[PDB]
């Protein structure tokens, strides 16, 4: 089945490469990390992968999460893991095309 990380921290991942294959949401998508229908995480932008811990604010459109956050004491928060890809190359450059 092999539902685990496939690009670990500090790895150079190109566009479209799968970062993590999972069953439940162990690792939530972050910056430049997209999700598929099967919860696979894939790298949208070429770069370097990092993992972080952040605050969780679910979609109100979702129901199984918008209510549990409604059951938490003052000063509470649901922290969760995220996997980002800091992009490496810039979008583009400008080069002389015509001298007229």
């Amino acid at each position: 089945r092999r539902q685990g990380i496939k690009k670990m921290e500090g790895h150079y991942v190109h566009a479209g490469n799968i970062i993590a294959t999972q069953r439940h949401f162990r690792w939530h998508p972050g910056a430049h990390v997209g999700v598929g229908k099967n919860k696979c995480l894939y790298a949208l932008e070429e770069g370097i992968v990092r993992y972080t811990k952040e605050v969780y604010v679910p979609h109100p459109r979702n129901t199984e999460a918008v209510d549990l956050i409604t059951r938490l004491p003052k000063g509470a928060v649901l922290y969760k893991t995220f996997v980002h890809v800091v992009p490496a190359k810039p979008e583009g450059t400008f080069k002389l095309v015509a001298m007229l």
Binding site: K53, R71, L72, P73, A76, L78, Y79, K80, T81
Partner: peptide
């Protein structure tokens, strides 16, 4: 992870009676 200081940061079940 389990062998890192950040372990047990995602716990929320204990925050529900």
């Amino acid at each position: 992870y389990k062998t890192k200081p950040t372990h047990g940061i995602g716990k929320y079940k204990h925050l529900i009676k």
